[PDB]
Design a protein around this ligand. Sequence first.
Ligand SMILES: CC(C)CCC[C@@H](C)[C@H]1CC[C@H]2[C@@H]3CC=C4C[C@@H](O)CC[C@]4(C)[C@H]3CC[C@]12C
Ligand SMILES: *[C@@H]1O[C@H](CO)[C@@H](O)[C@H](O)[C@H]1NC(C)=O
Ligand SMILES: *[C@@H]1O[C@H](CO)[C@@H](O)[C@H](O)[C@H]1NC(C)=O
Lengths: 173, 120, 1276
Amino acid sequence: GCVEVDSETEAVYGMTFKILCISCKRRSETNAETFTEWTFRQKGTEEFVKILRYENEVLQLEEDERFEGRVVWNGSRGTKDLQDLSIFITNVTYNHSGDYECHVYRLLFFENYEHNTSVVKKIHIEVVDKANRDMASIVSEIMMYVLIVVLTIWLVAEMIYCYKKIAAATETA
Amino acid sequence: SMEVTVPATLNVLNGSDARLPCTFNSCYTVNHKQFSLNWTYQECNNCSEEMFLQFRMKIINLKLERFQDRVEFSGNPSKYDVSVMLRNVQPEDEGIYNCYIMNPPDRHRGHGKIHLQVLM
Amino acid sequence: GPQSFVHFTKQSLALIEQRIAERKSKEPKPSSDLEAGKQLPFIYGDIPPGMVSEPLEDLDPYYADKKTFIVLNKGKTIFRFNATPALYMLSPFSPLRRISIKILVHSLFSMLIMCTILTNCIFMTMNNPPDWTKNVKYTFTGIYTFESLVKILARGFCVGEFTFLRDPWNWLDFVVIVFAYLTEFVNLGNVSALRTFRVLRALKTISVIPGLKTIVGALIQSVKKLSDVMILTVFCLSVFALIGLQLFMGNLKHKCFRNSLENNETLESIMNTLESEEDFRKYFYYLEGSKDALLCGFSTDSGQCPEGYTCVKIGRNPDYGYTSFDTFSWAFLALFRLMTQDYWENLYQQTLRAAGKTYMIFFVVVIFLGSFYLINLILAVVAMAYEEQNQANIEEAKQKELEFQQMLCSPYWIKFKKCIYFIVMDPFVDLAITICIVLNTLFMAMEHHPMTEEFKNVLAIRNLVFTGIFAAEMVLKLIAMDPYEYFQVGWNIFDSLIVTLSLVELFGLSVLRSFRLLRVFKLAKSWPTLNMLIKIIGNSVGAFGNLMLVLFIIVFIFAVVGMQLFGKSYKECVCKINDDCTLPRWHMNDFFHSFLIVFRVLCGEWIETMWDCMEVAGQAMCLIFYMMVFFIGNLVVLNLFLALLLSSFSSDANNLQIAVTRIKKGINYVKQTLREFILKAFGKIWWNIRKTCYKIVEHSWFESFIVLMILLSSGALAFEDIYIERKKTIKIILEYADKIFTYIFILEMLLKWIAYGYKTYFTNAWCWLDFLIVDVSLVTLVANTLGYSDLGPIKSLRTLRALRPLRALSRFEGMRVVVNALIGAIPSIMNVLLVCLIFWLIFSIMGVNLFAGKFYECINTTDGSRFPASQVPNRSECFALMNVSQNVRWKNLKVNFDNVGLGYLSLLQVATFKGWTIIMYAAVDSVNVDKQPKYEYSLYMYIYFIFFIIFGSFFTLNLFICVIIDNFNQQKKKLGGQDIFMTEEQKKYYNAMKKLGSKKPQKPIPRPGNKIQGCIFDLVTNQAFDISIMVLICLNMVTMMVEKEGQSQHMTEVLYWINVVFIILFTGECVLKLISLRHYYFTVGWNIFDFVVVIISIVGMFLADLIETYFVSPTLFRVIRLARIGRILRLVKGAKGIRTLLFALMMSLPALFNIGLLLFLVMFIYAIFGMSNFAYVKKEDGINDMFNFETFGNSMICLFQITTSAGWDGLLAPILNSKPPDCDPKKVHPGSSVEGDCGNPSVGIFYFVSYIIISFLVVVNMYIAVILENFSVATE
Ligand SMILES: CC(C)CCC[C@@H](C)[C@H]1CC[C@H]2[C@@H]3CC=C4C[C@@H](O)CC[C@]4(C)[C@H]3CC[C@]12C
Ligand SMILES: *[C@@H]1O[C@H](CO)[C@@H](O)[C@H](O)[C@H]1NC(C)=O
Ligand SMILES: *[C@@H]1O[C@H](CO)[C@@H](O)[C@H](O)[C@H]1NC(C)=O
């Protein structure tokens, strides 16, 4: 239905990257009208600058040279109730590394009640030249092979032991 | 039809006081914002429905010149009694009397007819 | 003998009185024969013409000494009275009494009373009777009053022995008449129709209708026998109601409340001013078209508020306020609802939304133990009671019969007659018409809704063909076998019937043509096991009919009474139960609708209709009415249905073969002649390693290791939820873990090959299943490795990973024993699946013919309101409105009667009573094929549904149960009386518990020498001490029952201090015992229980006064205070009924564990399948935010719910959406790469139907068997 998955934090230079921002409604049946502003600060600087503001259907980009021509929308389409506010960075540069805020402004409609809610998602990314396998998949394939060889060594250990015993019994008989 | 219990005939003397029993019976609780009732006079059978007592959020009197100061409310709407008091009845006060009661959420409007006769 | 007849003259009164005085100065059962209301023995022969109808002296010796006088009618009916003066006035000799008696003991009087009662009942069947018929009511009063005096002037009122009030039926009469007298001046209704039940006493003796005696007598004896079970039921529901009160008090008052209130308003300022729903709906959150505010909770596993509302405890409880655990009485009603499983799913879900999903353990415990155990106990008692009655009546009659017999031109037409008979023969002629009957049934099953004209008219010429053949065959038989001989055959009559009604339509009665399928059961004479089952059915047909007679008389009487007590209320207070100020779909204002409500209560559904009646007519009368009806109908008469079937399963030509012999003659002879014509024309090393692998694979190390691996693989499957793409580490881990688990299992299979051998491995079913599972895993693995995975079909292979837990089945003897019992029963399940499917096919073809394509409607998609037919008359105007307006749709139901298969599904929903309502409303609203449904335009299709329920629910679902239970008994008999549900080591423990229960003399506890210690001994071992302690326990139970939602702070402190003085008393008695009985106190099992609960009481008090003072955890406090219940569980030791009944449960628990284990494994498998398939459905009807198939927890919760079939229609309805108008094939779910909210209808249907069937076979049927066995062992 609606799962809030956290963005990936590793971008490869010269390739494409997808920044995830998923903000859901506590009750899926309710009706809302959401827009979003995205702001970013570069690694090395202390100031969050707005870079884009996505409205009902159209996307507006700020005049920033770092993102202009290389950021497309990759979130929800054809609705005012946006539960996915993701963006795309085509041709990732070394300048797209820092801290991102995904501002979600959501106005819910009730019987005679209109609630103005906000929610902020924080995403940190770094731009590398080479993608690195995470340790969790490194450790685990090395560990997958430990249990293979120790279970196999264990089994054939028990086979040999039981056999030199049974071979003795037959000779005895 | 909502149960309205009224006397068809009313008998009062000249110079008497007269009470007018009109009691409805409805399952629903009386809500004052909702509850309406109206009391009409009829000098003759085929004459007009001139009111002299209204209820809407409260008790209203239309100060009719026929019943100079005689008409007085004598009921408890939550007790379902809505009778009225005709003080000091004179001969001119024979006719026909109605109490049109609507107690929402019931959609039927109750009706009672009362013919008061001043024997002299 | 006969010469013993004599007129009671004062002298025999004086000789009886003298004898009584002699007996007094000095200071036995009577002839069941003579016993009143009986025929005078033929041994006495005829009565002297002057002695009839006269106070005569007492025959029976038992009473000859006491004071009495008997009178006999001209029908030798014995009537016993009291010699004592009536109200100290009338004497037997007195002429005034002589006349009362003369009238009383006389046939005409009673006949006329019966006539009066009947007339009255049918007159009351009216709703608005003519003004000139009220005076008939007062006319009836005086006759019932003259009634009560004829008997009283005759035999007195109450003081004596044979008197008016002594008879329980006369008690009923007295209640009726006094009630009438009261209502004459009181607002209450009329119950003058309950005295119709004396027709039941009439039937208790009717001769013309056979066996109405066995059914009414069993109906009354079951009510008498059910006493102990009722006490236990009350005790058990009060314990669970106390637990539920403690855990859920005030929870159903949770509501979501606005966070920004406009002027300066508070939750109190506004709650003192809110009146209707309109203004409640602007401060609290309501779903669309819902009467009650949405519930919520304070936990994380509870229901969520929308953003901008906050959960708060305020306002009323749901369902008009009748659903709550706020007081002991409402919690007792909730627990009775849960016990009878009536719409429990709503309570289950409301409770879980308010409290939290972790409180499902409460419902699991309640449902399984309480519901299943107690309901099957009621059945076990009724079954036994019916069996004893039948037996006694059959032997009663035996005695009689044995005693009785121990004492004891035309020749041309005849030429044609024989000529026709010659050609008529079973192998050639009768076998032909049977295959033509099944061909015709296939052609009738081929009709569906969206049909052409040609196809419909081709089926019509086929019907002409067939009915012509069948009428032709009719007259041949009639001339060979004349009109005197044709009626002699109760099977040929059925043939005549169908034929003549088929000619009537030829020259709405078309729906009576599928009953010729019932003639296919002559072939059932060939297949002998099917023959035996048909024979058993045929013997229970008579009893079935008599019970149906009793069932429909009872439903009639309760429907006149409801219409009379609650009829006007439904019309005058209609706007309280209906926003449109119109009568709801179920009401008691007329007789057809009252009948329908009563029938729905008999079918197990009483609460929803009771809410409405309680709202229009008060709580007390509606409760008494519905409880009367539910007891007598559902708890006794339906159980009697199954009871008569179960007893019919125990009591201890074929021309097909002639034709087979003819065939052996022909096919063999002709082929041989053709052949003749053709001829005319023309070192142990390998054995040592095999022994070594055997030794390895048998060791308990290997066994436990493989079992642990099996459990780890199964548990791993539960993590593949919809939130798997947030837990990245875990998903990587589990991929590689699946790799190594497949490796282990392959090594196991190869080791088993080497060890055992191919022959042994592949002649074994457990090994075959292990092999299949490992092969699916190996294939999927190599596909994922060879690049070309995700091919389309390989995802179906990944869903087969739901079958991995099936490996756990082989390993557990507990699950194995149960699986084995079921597999032994299966061949007898198929034999009845056949007969039942034939019946259901008949009904389904009928339903198709009645309702095909008639369930369409022009709805407004915004509200879901049907357009009034005055606006949208047909389909063409619905489409014309779809052109101009927008939210309009000609929409069919999803489960309908458009064809025979959808008819079968419709019928399953009606038979299980889940989703049957919407089908019935569509049916009774249907007009025609493309016409708008009009409200209750076809009101009497309810009769179709009534009849199906009798034969498809009350007979079919019961026949399954009977044949399965019989098979289990046969199995145990073949094993030699051995239990088929317990393992080898559970049987040992079972043998120990029977010894626990066998009463054995206990050695005495010596009296200690110390004077003081001895005095305490003399006190504690007195029987007054333990009566006193039982009274104190009841008073404590009352002190617990008094607690309430919203009590004062004074109430809490006084209740606390009362419980404190109770704790002190119980600790005191324990200490008194421990110093008089010394060390011999702990040698009694109940004394140890007493000690443990003393400890848990004191500890619980101090711990809860800690967990409320230092900590602030409220749910832990609530859970600790459940320790108090221990003190009321001692109300079992002094209650032999309750104790005996609970011992049956204690000795059933081992077998009730293996069933639980199997059930849990099946649940696990289905849950994994569910998470794979139905995780992304549109969430319409039963699938919502909390009850869905997204996570393992939610899956298991839904599956536990539908384990009682509750709400399975609601869970399946959203999975039947497959087309763009209802679903979206390209829905984007945020967070995943799955597209689409549509469901797969075939997978859904199979899933849910197979699940409810398995539960029926493994849970319901097996529980019944275990309880029936242990109830008998425990009462014996
Ligand atoms: C209309 C409803 C409420 C009641 C219908 C009662 C009918 C179905 C019952 C009442 C009496 C019953 C009959 C009683 C006796 C026998 C004799 C038996 O050897 C065959 C069945 C048969 C013939 C029963 C058939 C069914 C029966 C006729
Ligand atoms: C007075 O009563 C009459 C009854 O006929 C009703 O129609 C009318 O609306 C009432 N008037 C007011 C002002 O309530
Ligand atoms: C509530 O708000 C009003 C706003 O006009 C203010 O005048 C009043 O003092 C407030 N009362 C409380 C409860 O503080």
